[model samples]
Every structure is written in C-alpha cells, then in structure tokens.
Target chain A: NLPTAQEVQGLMARYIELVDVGDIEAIVQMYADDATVEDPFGQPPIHGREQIAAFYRQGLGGGKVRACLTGPVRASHNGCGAMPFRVEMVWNGQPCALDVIDVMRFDEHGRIQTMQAYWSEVNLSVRE
Target chain B: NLPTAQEVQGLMARYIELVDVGDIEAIVQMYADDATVEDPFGQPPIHGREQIAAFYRQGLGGGKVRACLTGPVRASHNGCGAMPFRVEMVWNGQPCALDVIDVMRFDEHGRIQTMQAYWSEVNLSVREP
Candidate 1:
C-alpha cells in the first residue's frame, strides 16, 4: 500500500526543516537505504545511503545554507510530493537566493526512495 | 542539447496562462505528439497527442476553472521545470481551491514530453457560501 497524502506532506515539510537547520544525518536517515538523489535534475543520481550522505555532507557541511518553503507542499495520490523552497547562501562572496522545487517519492515504509531538485542559474538571484 | 533554463521557464509561464484562459487547443499544442500526461501522479499516464488532447479537453471544457501561479517556476539544468499553482473552481456546489505542483520535461524542440501534476484531497480547500 502507498503512504497517505498526509504522511507524504508531513515528510516533505520535515525534509525542508531538516535542510533549513543543516541536519545532514537526520536528512540522510529519512531516505531509504538504496535511495537516489538527483539535485539540479539532470546530473547523474547519487545512489545508496553512503553516497547520499557524502552528497549531503558537502552541501550541508558548511552550515551557511538556509532554506524555507515558498509554497505549500503538493502531495500526489501516489506516495510522492513536491515542494517549492528558496535557499539563501553566499556564493562568490555575494549573498544569493536560489528558488527550487524538489520532488520526492516515498517508499512503502515512508522513507524517501527518490529525490529530484529543479533549479538552474536563472533561479539564482544575487545581491549586488 | 537541452533547452535553456530561460526557455523552460518561459514555457511554464505560458502554460499557466493558457490554462487560466481555458485555451485547450493552445495547451494541447504545447505537448509533443508522443507526449504523456499523468495528472495527479499516481494514475496511469495518458499517452500520445490524441489521448492527451482528450484529457485536457475534459478538464478545460467546462471553462469554470481559473488558475494562478502561487510561486515562481523553477527550471532545472536539464530540459525540465516545475511550478506551483492554485486552481479555483466549484466542487460539489461549493467554491474550492486546489493547490498543485506540475513538473514538465521538455524535448529539444521545447515541446513538453512528459507532464505530471502532484495534488490530492489534502490540497483542496472548500469555502462555504
């Protein structure tokens, strides 16, 4: 059986909160052991828990990145959900904000099975 | 080569505009001849242009629905993008709004090759008159 919409939505919210606080370990634990992540959507996916942890470590390790949801999470009839959020960080010594939409599919056990992030250069806004 | 982020973003905006105006023909034109649509995600996909057209015809045919973007469209490094929007319509004789997030993957020619909408009952809000 698939996860409930409420369950999917709740997990999405928790994922955003985890990212906001730079909770790398907790975030990684939310995923299935064989989960895959494709940040920026087109890149090769990072597979498995160890690789996923390394990917998050590089991103959240700095502790400089913060994120907040820009819109409510949209849950699917399936065990999936999507949320839009903005990440604030400094890039090249300039404050920048990137708008992103992340789509996640949860496993039967409620752990994320796949994650894809949609964002590109155009979504980045730099403070001049 | 993949479409640029700007191009993807532009198409997403246009899609919303078409949907809001209930222009079913224009909306169908945005898809590739062999495109697939999986509105609400979990259902079996509607495949091919003919089937896709029929699907949109049913949704937009009523002309009672209006939609607006709730947030900016997020474009990916590849030929894909996603946008959050709200659709206002009457459900069960009551005014209601449904929050939705649509993810679209575009072909090299800028036509949507695959489209999926994520939404469920939890996203619906019915207002009492």
Candidate 2:
C-alpha cells in the first residue's frame, strides 16, 4: 500500500528540519539504499546512498545553511510528493538565497527512492 | 482562496482529456493571461499566454497524442498542484513515450499562472507499437 498524504508530509517535515540542522547522515537515512538525487532537473543524477549523502555534504561545506518550506506540501495517492522550499546561506561570505522545487518518489518501505529538484543558476539571489 | 484538492483533480482530468484531443484553444484558455511554461525544466522558459499557446500549438501540430495520469494529482492550500503523467505519441513515424512531472500555480480564478514540467531527453523512450 502507498503512503497517505499525512505520512508523506510527516516525512518531509523531518527532512526539511534535518536539512536546516545539517544532519547529513540522518538526511541520507531518509532515502532508500539505492536512491538517486538530481539536484537540478537538467543535471546528471547522483546515484546511490553514499553519493547522495556526499552531494549534500559538499553543498554544506562546513557553512551553516537554513531552509524553510515556502509553499504547501503536495503528496499524491501514490508514493510521490512535492514541496517548494527556500534555502538561505552565506556563500563565500555573500548572503545568498536559492529557491527549490523538490519532487520525490518513495519505495515500498516509504523511503525516498528518487528525488529531483528544479533549479538553475539563474534562481540564485546573492546579496552583497 | 485556493482551490480544493478535488477541484484541482477535476482540472487535471479535463486537461489530459483535452490535450489528447488536440484542443489547442481550449487548452490555452485554461491558463492565466500572464502564464509561463517550462516544458523541460532546463531550457529557457516560455513566457506569457501567447507564447505558451504557440508552444503548445507546435507540440500538437495536428498530431494525435495520448496521455495517462501515472499517479494521483497532488494539490495544496496555496493554489498549487502537481502530477506525474506519461505521454505517448508517434514522432517522425516512431512511437515514443515521455515521462513528465508537472507543477502548476493557480491564479485567483483558478487559472494556471505558472506551469513547469520536469523532464529530460533521458526520459524519452522509443518503443515498439
């Protein structure tokens, strides 16, 4: 059976919070062992749990990042979910904000099997 | 006020049906005047209603296509909606299928103001009919 909207939302609630705290390990645990992530829709996919975790780690790069849900979370009857979010941080000492649209597919175990984010360099807003 | 989940589902139901029928004008009417579309997330966006309509027109081009909603239509209280769909058609006399994930934002009248589809060439498949 697939997950309900409530269940999916609960997972995302934790995922977003964990992202803010820079809990890379815990964040990777939310995905299936063979999960894949495409940070931007057009880029090549990052496959497997280890690689996906590394991708997030590199993005953090010892700097603190904060994320907040910008719009409502949408989860379907099937194991699919989408959430629009905003990530803010100081990149190279310049405050930057990035808008992201995330779409996810879950496996039978309710772990995210595939994660895709729609964003490009143009979406980045940097403040001097 | 935003549309309910049920309302959004209804809109998608009609959208897929009309798209398969190649109703270009009707499809254009579904969007707001300032609507924009990114058919494939990576490319530059198609802005405004006229450009969006023309883009769809070129896609349809009097050719028949079939679209099936692969998953449930998800909606939120912010007048936003999303769904994964599979579209099959014959291009250049070859049958192909495209996997698409569409995200939409609605206007005050429930018309779509912004529509984005997440898909890439990698998702396209040519299959035997």
Candidate 3:
C-alpha cells in the first residue's frame, strides 16, 4: 500500500499476479485507499475500497472471464512518487473483453490514497 | 521552399482540404507519387492515386466523411524526412466517427511520397460541438 514507484511497480506486479491467479482477498489489500473504477460499457463508476474490491471480485471471481491482464503500461516507482498506470483486460465471452486505465496516487506513508480509472470496451481479439 | 515542418504543414493543410472538401484534383495533386494509405476497418491499403484517389473520391464525393477538422495538432514547416500528424473527425453518425494517427513522409522536394496511418473506432463519443 505504501511504496515508491519501484515499490508500486512491485505492488502492481503483485496485484496483477493476484488478479491473474484470481486471489480476491490479496487483490483487495493491494488497492489504494480511495480506488475508483469506471466500467465504460457498464453502469456508473465504482469508487472506494469496498466497491473497487467488489469490482475486481466480479471480474476475477467469475468463471466466465479468462485471459485477463492488468498493470502499469508506463511505470515509474520512485519511492512515494505519483504513479500513472493503465490496466487493460479482455473477457472471453459474448461481448468479448474490456480495457481499463487507472491512475493511482500515493500518500507519503506508501498507502494508495486515491485511484481514478477509465474503462472502455476493448475492440480487440481474445489473444492478449 | 525546402521541406520543413512549416512547409510540410502547408502541404498537410492542403491535403486535409483535399480530403475534407473532396476536391478530387487537389487531393490527388498533393499526394506524393508513392503515397500509401490504410483504412484499418476497411479493405486493403490504398497505394498511389489510382487506389488512393479512388479511396478519396469514394469518401469525399459520397459525403460519408466530412474532413471537419483535419488540420495539424503539432505541425512545423522544418522540411524533412517525415511529418507526424494526428487527425480527429466525427463521421456524421452511427459507427461513422473515428480517430486516426498518421505519419506523412515528405520527399526532399516537399512532396508527400508516403503516408502510414493507424486507425480505430470512437468507442467513445458523438461530435466535437
């Protein structure tokens, strides 16, 4: 929760691992304090830890979803610095997949204070 | 004048018009001999006027694509190897609108010999206005 860019990178990498493994609980712990999620095609945005965790749970927990990957596209983890991150995912069904953009802000203590995400339909193949 | 960002820009401005106005001749005139265009969602890539012109004529003449604003986001007349440009336009309605990433290659004489474009859907919005 409280880490530098390098640390956050590690945090994100671990977070992706959790999501990949569908480790719901561990995934929740990695989320910054005020994480926000926007599901472009779905209803309104999801905010806060409980909601954000629920969002991830709904995503990673479900059997319908597979081949999902998310994390920093361009990451710089200088201890406690601002981390601009992007997460893209593709669900393997009906409507197919979705892509998401997330920017995480950290407090001095290394806890993730805020997270604002932008989500949209991924008009891409199921390959990635 | 020699190819510069500024000079290339003028050409780009003119080309956008050729595209926007659908002025068949002007559009064809501005295109470099070895021009190449890709309409991602569409069929094959159009190279040279025969194909490129057909490409333009079909769109502009049909009034399907209104160039709207194909100006320059970051343009310079510092004549050179290639010019980088980004164009955004709302294609009337439906799945019409699109965002395009284009890189224009200009010859020493300032002619645009080649153009490579990366395109995708709006998956986003309606119109600028």
Candidate 4:
C-alpha cells in the first residue's frame, strides 16, 4: 500500500507538534525499540527514547525556545518516504532556520521504524 | 545486533552495483514489498519492486555513469543511520557531482524498507522524463 502525501506530512506534523508542545513522551512513542538519529554536526547520533528525550530536555530546558517550525523542501512518495526540507523557527525570540533532510521508514504495521535527521548549523546548532 | 561501519559500507556498495550494472531485478529485491523511494527532483517516486526496478532500468540501461561515495562529516549510531555528504562522480568521462544528503532506514530484519536521496546538480543534463 502506498502512503499518501497527507500521511507523510502528517508524520512530520506529529513530530513538530510533539516537540513544540514539549511532549517528549509522545514523541518517543514513535520510535522502534532501537531507533537512531544522526545530525549534520559531528556530534554523536542520539539513539533510543532516553537519548532523544534528553535532546529535547536540553533544548527546551527553562523554556527558552518556543517553536520548531518546519516544512518540506523536496519530498518523494516512493516506498522510502524521503523529505529534504528547510526549517524556519524562532528560538528564544531569535529568528533562525536551517535546511534539513529527514529520511523515515515504516514497518509493515505502519509504525515508524527509523528516522534520520540531516541538518546543518542553522536548524540545530543555532539554538544554543 | 547493531550494524557495524563495514556493514553500512557494504550496503552502499551493493546499491552501487545494482544500479550501475542496470540490474533492476537485483535492485528490486532489496526493498520490502511496501518499500518506498523519494527523490528531490519533484518527479513521482517509484514504489514497490516493479516500479523501483523500472526506475533503475530507465537510468542505467546504457551504463553511462560511475559513482563512488565517501563517508564521515556526520553520522549517528542510533537506529536511524544518516549520512549527509557531497558525491563526486564522473559520467561519460565528464566530471560531475552534487551535494546530497541521503536518508536510509532499516527494518528490524535488517532490510531496507525505505531510502530517500537528496541532491542538487549542475550537470548540463541528466537523462530524464
């Protein structure tokens, strides 16, 4: 079965929603037992629910950054469901944005099995 | 068990072989039945084994290009392995390349169910619809 563009967008929307609302638990539920995330910076890739949650906690601590707005730059509907995108956001009332490409895969049951984030300085590093 | 760096390189090598050889059949075997492929080119993404094979068949029928990829600059060991790198290749004796960030995902079974390629090109032309 093919995933609709709406469905793909929906997954990304869910991601943005969870992080934006400060709901790390909701976000962690999407990953498989062993999920990983790789960022563009040479930093260690975050793995599993605990690390992912910690990533959010570090950024959102003291409630400094509010919105994590993102949209697709280029997207594909092949079985891979790949999205290359640019993210615009306001963190601590400062304007910032970055180009990012995220690859997502779904299992037969339709649960997201893995997601890899490819982003440069603008989307991630500028926050700190 | 987590895949090692060697395993990752092997998967990439397999991909190059299947595509470069124009072996669409072999290429299709890599994807799960429900697998999907997305590209940044704004074209309809080819899904499933049949369509994916066709995508390769269309591109590699003539075997006009050779591409070799490198690693590093960024990576994570979490289940979601990601690589963002610049690809340098020579097609038809003409040097060409692109800055691409590719995203790949695997099932617990260690099979790739989805692969998305992102790149921008400066080549005068790439065979296309």
Q: Highest lDDT among the candidates is held by which one?
A: 1
Q: What TM value does the first chain of each candidate achieve?
A: 0.94, 0.94, 0.60, 0.64
Candidate 1, B64-104: lDDT as tens digits: 78889988888886889999999987766688889999999
List the candidate 2 regions with Cα displacement exceeding 4 Å: B1-101, B104-129
> Which candidate order results from sorting by DockQ in descending order?
1, 4, 2, 3
Residue B15, model 3: lDDT of: 68
Please provide TM-scores, in order, for all candidate models, with all chains considered together.
Answer: 0.94, 0.54, 0.40, 0.44
Interface RMSD score of candidate 2: 13.3
Runs in model 4 lying further than 4 Å from the true structure: A1-128, B1-6, B41-44, B73-75, B84-97, B121-129
Q: Write the per-residue lDDT of candidate 3 for residues A14-97, one digit (tens) a residue.
A: 555666567778766765566555443223556688987777777767563433333122233332221122334545543344
Residue B88 lDDT in candidate 1: 88
Q: List DockQ, one per candidate, in order.
A: 0.87, 0.04, 0.02, 0.07
For candidate 2, the per-residue lDDT at B121 reads: 45
TM-score, model 4 to reference: 0.44
Chain B: TM-scores of all predictions = 0.93, 0.92, 0.67, 0.66
Off by over 4 Å in 1: none
CAPRI tier for the interface of model 1? high
Question: Candidates 3 and 4: which is better by lDDT?
Answer: 4
Candidate closest to the true structure, highest DockQ: 1
Tens digits of per-residue lDDT for model 1 on A81-127?
99999999886678888899999999889999999999888888888
Model 4: how far is A73 from its true place, Å? 12
